[PDB]
Structures are given as C-alpha cells and as structure tokens.
Amino acid sequence: DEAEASKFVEEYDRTSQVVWNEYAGANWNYNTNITTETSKILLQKNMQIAQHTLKYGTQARKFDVNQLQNTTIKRIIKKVQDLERAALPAQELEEYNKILLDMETTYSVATVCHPQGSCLQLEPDLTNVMATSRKYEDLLWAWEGWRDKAGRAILQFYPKYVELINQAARLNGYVDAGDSWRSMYETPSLEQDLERLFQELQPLYLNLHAYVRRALHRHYGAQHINLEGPIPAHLLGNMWAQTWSNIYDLVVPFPSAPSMDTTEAMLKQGWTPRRMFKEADDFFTSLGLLPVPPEFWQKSMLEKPTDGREVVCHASAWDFYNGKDFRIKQCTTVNLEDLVVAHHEMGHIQYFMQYKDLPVALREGANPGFHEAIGDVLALSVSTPKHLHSLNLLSSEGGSDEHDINFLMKMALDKIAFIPFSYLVDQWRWRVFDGSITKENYNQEWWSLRLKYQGLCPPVPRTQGDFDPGAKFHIPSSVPYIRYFVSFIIQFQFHEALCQAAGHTGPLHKCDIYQSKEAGQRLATAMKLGFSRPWPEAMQLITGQPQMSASAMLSYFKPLLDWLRTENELHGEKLGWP
Ligand SMILES: *[C@@H]1O[C@H](CO[C@@H]2O[C@@H](C)[C@@H](O)[C@@H](O)[C@@H]2O)[C@@H](O[C@@H]2O[C@H](CO)[C@@H](O[C@@H]3O[C@H](CO)[C@@H](O)[C@H](O[C@H]4O[C@H](CO)[C@@H](O)[C@H](O)[C@@H]4O)[C@@H]3O)[C@H](O)[C@H]2NC(C)=O)[C@H](O)[C@H]1NC(C)=O
Ligand SMILES: NCCCC[C@H](NC(=O)[C@@H](S)Cc1ccccc1)C(=O)N[C@@H](Cc1c[nH]c2ccccc12)C(=O)O
Ligand SMILES: *[C@@H]1O[C@H](CO)[C@@H](O)[C@H](O)[C@H]1NC(C)=O
Ligand SMILES: [Cl-]
Ligand SMILES: [Cl-]
Ligand SMILES: [Zn+2]
Numbered sequence: 001d002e003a004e005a006s007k008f009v010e011e012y013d014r015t016s017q018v019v020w021n022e023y024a025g026a027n028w029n030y031n032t033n034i035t036t037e038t039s040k041i042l043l044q045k046n047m048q049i050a051q052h053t054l055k056y057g058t059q060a061r062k063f064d065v066n067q068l069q070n071t072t073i074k075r076i077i078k079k080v081q082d083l084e085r086a087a088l089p090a091q092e093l094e095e096y097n098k099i100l101l102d103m104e105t106t107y108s109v110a111t112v113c114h115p116q117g118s119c120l121q122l123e124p125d126l127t128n129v130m131a132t133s134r135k136y137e138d139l140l141w142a143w144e145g146w147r148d149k150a151g152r153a154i155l156q157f158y159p160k161y162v163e164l165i166n167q168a169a170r171l172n173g174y175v176d177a178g179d180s181w182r183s184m185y186e187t188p189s190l191e192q193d194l195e196r197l198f199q200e201l202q203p204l205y206l207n208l209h210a211y212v213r214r215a216l217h218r219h220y221g222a223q224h225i226n227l228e229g230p231i232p233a234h235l236l237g238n239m240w241a242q243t244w245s246n247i248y249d250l251v252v253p254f255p256s257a258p259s260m261d262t263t264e265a266m267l268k269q270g271w272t273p274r275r276m277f278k279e280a281d282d283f284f285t286s287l288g289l290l291p292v293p294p295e296f297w298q299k300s301m302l303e304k305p306t307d308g309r310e311v312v313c314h315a316s317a318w319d320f321y322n323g324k325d326f327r328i329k330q331c332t333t334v335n336l337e338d339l340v341v342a343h344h345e346m347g348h349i350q351y352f353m354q355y356k357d358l359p360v361a362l363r364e365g366a367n368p369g370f371h372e373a374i375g376d377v378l379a380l381s382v383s384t385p386k387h388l389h390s391l392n393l394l395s396s397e398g399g400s401d402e403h404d405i406n407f408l409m410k411m412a413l414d415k416i417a418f419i420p421f422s423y424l425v426d427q428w429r430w431r432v433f434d435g436s437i438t439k440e441n442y443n444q445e446w447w448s449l450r451l452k453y454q455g456l457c458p459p460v461p462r463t464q465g466d467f468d469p470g471a472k473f474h475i476p477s478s479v480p481y482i483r484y485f486v487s488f489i490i491q492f493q494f495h496e497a498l499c500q501a502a503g504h505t506g507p508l509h510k511c512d513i514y515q516s517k518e519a520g521q522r523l524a525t526a527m528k529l530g531f532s533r534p535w536p537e538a539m540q541l542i543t544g545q546p547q548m549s550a551s552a553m554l555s556y557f558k559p560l561l562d563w564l565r566t567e568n569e570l571h572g573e574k575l576g577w578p
Contacts, residue, residue, distance in 0.1 A: 194486075204412070229578065259394065259395075284520075292346070344375040420455075428445060488553075497544065
C-alpha cells in the first residue's frame, strides 16, 4: 500500500535527522581533537547509527519497490534497503568500525623524523618540502619517508578492511565494494564512459608530460631523466604527483613574461585563512547564491589548532543534518593552492544549503562528482588574471599572448595532470575489491597503473612491506576517488555553460563569471534537486544536454595543445613511455 510506504519515509526522515546529527557531532569532535575519549564516543555512536540503519533498512526491505507507484517514495525506499556497514553481524561491525578509526588515526598522526632532528607532519611541513625543494635527494627523503611512515603503517589493516567492506557489500546485494561504489552513479555504462573520457584527454596529457619531462631533464640532469621514459614520481611539486602546478617556475613557457609570486603577495598583504573563506563566500553571493550562516564562522575549524590537539587535517565539509549547522575543517595554509581548496569546500557547503529541505535520503549531489565540482567551477573564475588582479595578487597582463599561454600552462599543471591520477586510484581499488589484486601484489599493481596511466616511476625500488596507496588519504579513509575524475571533466562543462549564460564571447579560458546572477540561477536550480532525480537531469539543467563530455575541457585548453605540439615537435620529443 502506498500509504504505509509514505508513512515509512516520513518516519525514516524524522528519526534519521536526529541520529545523523548526533553521529556527525561525535565524528566532528574526533576529527578536530583525536583522543582516546573522543575515539571511544565515536565508536559508540557508530553502533547507535547502525542500530537505526538496521531497524529502518530491515523494514524497507519488506516493501516490494516494484509495486510502489510514487517515484520519489520508491526511490527513497530502494536506497534505504542498502544498510551499508550495518549489514554486518555485530562482531564484524565492531571490528570494521575499529579498523576504519585505526587507519584514519594512523594516517593523521604519522610523522617523518630527521635523525636526532625535527619531525615533520604532512600538513604543512612535508607538503611545503615537496612544493618548494628543487634538490633531488631532499625531495626523495620526504617522498620515501612519508611512504615508509604512513603507507607501511596502513598495510597491517588493509586486508581485513577489504574483507569486511566486501562482506558488507555482498550482504547489500552487490558483488563487491567496488560494485557498490560505482552504483552511486546509477550509470551501467560508467566504466566505458570514463575510459572514453580518459582517452580523449590523452593528446593533452601526453604533450604536457613530454614538455615537463624535458624541463625536468634540464634542471635535474640528463643522468636522472630519461627523455623516452617515465618521470620520477617525487619531482612534480606534490606528494602524490597528482597536480604539478608547484613546478611552474621550472616549466614557464615564456620566461620573458614573468608572473607575480602569489604566495608572497598573499602573505605581504596579510591574507589569513578567514580572508580566504570570506572571499569564497563573496563569490557565491555575487552569483545570487546563499551566504554561509553565522554559525559556520563560529563552529568551523579553518586552520590547524595551535594548542597541541592532533586533528585530521585533510580539508572537508560537513553537513550536520539539521538544515542550519554546516562546517569546514581544513588546516589552511595561506597560498593560492589552498585558496582553490577553500572554494572547493565552500561549494560543498553551498550544495548542503541548497538541498537542505529534501528528505535526508535525497540530500546528496546528483552524483558524487557533481558534489565535488561546484566549488571548483567558481575557482576556475577566481584563478583568471582578471580576478587575481582584482585581489592584488597579479599585475595586469593586458592581453599578451605570452601571458595567456603562461596562464594556460599554470592551469594545465593542475587540471590536466590530475586526469590520469584521478582515473587510476579507483582502477586500483576496484581490482582490489574484485579480488584480481591481492595483498601479494598491492604495491606492484599500484606502480603498474602509475606507469600505465600517469607515466611515472618510483625513484627508489619498492620492497615487500611497502604499501604506497596507504600514503594517500582516501585509501585509509575509505573515500571513493572516481568522483574527482568526474568532477574535473564536468566542471569545465559547467564553466562553459555558465559563461554562455553570462553572455561571454571569445576564448573559454578568458571567462570570469564573478557577479553573474544568470550563472548562479543555473547552478541553484540543479543543486536544489539533490539526489532526487538521476544525474542527467541536473546535467541538462546546467548545460542544455545530458551527457558527460570532455569537449569543454578540450576547448578551454586548445591554445595550449597547439603550443605544446609545436614546442614538442621542435625539440623532437617522443610522446609517451614504454
Ligand atoms: C510523490 O511523492 C512526493 C513526496 O511527497 C512528500 O513526501 C511524502 C513522504 C509525504 O510526506 C507527502 O505528503 C509529501 O508531499 C511528492 O513530491 C512533493 O510534491 C509536492 C507537491 O508538488 C511538493 O510541494 C512543494 O513543496 C515546496 C516546499 O515546501 C513548496 O515551495 C511548493 O510550493 C510551490 O509550488 C506550488 C505548486 O506545487 C505553488 O502553489 C506554491 O505557491 C509554490 O510555488 C510545493 O508545495 C513537495 O516539495 C514534493 N516533495 C518532494 C520531496 O519532491 C510528489 O508530488 C508525489 N508524486 C505524485 C505523482 O503524486
Ligand atoms: N590539497 C588538496 C585538498 C583537497 C581536499 C578535498 N577534500 C574533499 O573532497 C572532502 S570535501 C571529501 C571528504 C574527505 C574526507 C572524508 C569525507 C569526505 C579532496 O579530497 N580532493 C582530492 C582531489 C583534489 C586535490 N587537490 C584539489 C584541489 C581542489 C579540489 C580537489 C582537489 C584530493 O585531496 O586528493
Ligand atoms: C579534546 O578532547 C578531550 C577528551 O574528550 C576533552 O577533554 C577536551 O575538552 C577536548 N578539547 C577540545 C578543544 O575540544
Ligand atoms: Cl605513490
Ligand atoms: Cl565516487
Ligand atoms: Zn570535496
């Protein structure tokens, strides 16, 4: 009966608001103050939320969704039939929650120590070494040390984690946890769709890779860079070689068109983490989107605490499931990279505020990639010379073709370099979850994919005992990654569409949507849908068509593709590696 199903959804929504708000508070208190006591309370709230999930999920499974006529009620009930970890028997649920907490804690408190010297944390210390050192051996120490201290320490937990998350997935009707995660996109063609998008980005990536490889050969020396091989993974300015923009100074296309030191400008002008988030809030409200509430400024953790607390530094945005309390937790450093991250996080908050009035089961992005994309769209405009000049962080550039290619290169070092990384993380994990990669070859298969997709090699041979995926936050934290690949494709589709909505003409990369109410209205209409409809509808509302497409990203970077081809041809580069 339709009436029992409607009553059930109302009861689930009321009770879920209460329980999820309590869980979120305990999880926040642990993430912002890692102690034995906050850990104990969080594990207890894990059992409370599981009790609720089991009670309502068991009832949801007694409905035959095929006979429900209302499509919204049918959709909610179907989703509530997935108990996630609460499907596990009690003993295994306890073990799984403990493993998750132990992995997170281990990653978050790991340090790398000089002999009878100082000990460095990942944020900010090791991140700063990778961004700024130009000495092969110093970069190697940080890169190898982080893997030795974080990655190795996760290995003891990972096989049992895999066993238990897969067991939960099978108890929810999937074949393994990777099947469960992929299902979040409601797109049976997902694997082939993503493969086609990756292939379309290959001209740009291969050309970028060859050009950067030549520049690294010039700086690090011919004995350390093979012009026909993969690039050593510690030289790209980033711990994971996932974004390459910190080595811009080594690869500047037109050195006769120098660009301001944006970190020094932000520091000399007294920028603080609060100013960075205030700028993001202003960009959203300039589009007619919602301001964050006063409570956000009182409750958020916008910088690393100075009082000794251990915290989870990795930037994240939090919905407390009461329609009022939204927060960001980020160990913000004052630089342009973290200004972009601040916009990324503020986009999550915007999404939370836009869909706050839907049933909690529908309070998610259209798919996980849409959630990750919103803030990045605005950050594309923040990063333009027009906007940066308005913040006093760049000198006016006028229209110089040299400054234009320089700008495109800076953007490509983040956006294009990340495409193969973001593709490969879950190619690896899906094969772990399906059993085709075992603990016998975790690390070998990781490196096989780092080579295949990114064209990188480890600077030191790996040994039994190494577990380099464990040194990347999302692995021990059990956060899916393909969302970030989807995000980087679709954020350019959204930029293109919002630029058109704002009446921009001329090259896509010159567009700045600051203050466009037309652009904001497109985004708001899609975000208000939350997860109520399959994601092609939201895609259609923003862009006027329903597919994911690399055409917008390719259009944005077309001038750079042309420049890179001419430059690599002049130097005789052989694209790719064996
Ligand atoms: C299938 O069922 C869904 C969900 O029903 C809702 O949840 C159930 C569990 C149960 O509690 C129901 O009683 C409950 O409605 C239906 O989707 C809802 O549809 C209604 C009617 O369209 C929407 O009501 C709207 O709510 C807005 C927020 O308060 C409000 O602004 C809207 O007013 C605006 O639009 C109206 C015209 O509709 C206009 O007169 C106003 O002046 C103003 O512009 C409006 O009242 C709910 O938001 C919907 N909820 C969800 C979650 O989608 C759905 O209609 C139903 N389908 C069928 C075919 O029956
Ligand atoms: N220095 C980067 C910090 C980015 C933090 C972001 N954070 C989440 O998405 C949180 S909101 C999700 C979460 C985390 C923990 C638990 C639950 C949910 C995140 O993870 N980006 C991915 C990809 C990425 C790298 N650079 C970026 C710059 C801008 C936008 C994205 C990226 C990553 O860092 O690899
Ligand atoms: C950190 O947690 C401990 C243990 O629960 C508690 O006593 C202390 O007040 C907490 N500090 C903060 C700043 O939340
Ligand atoms: Cl690695
Ligand atoms: Cl995902
Ligand atoms: Zn995010």
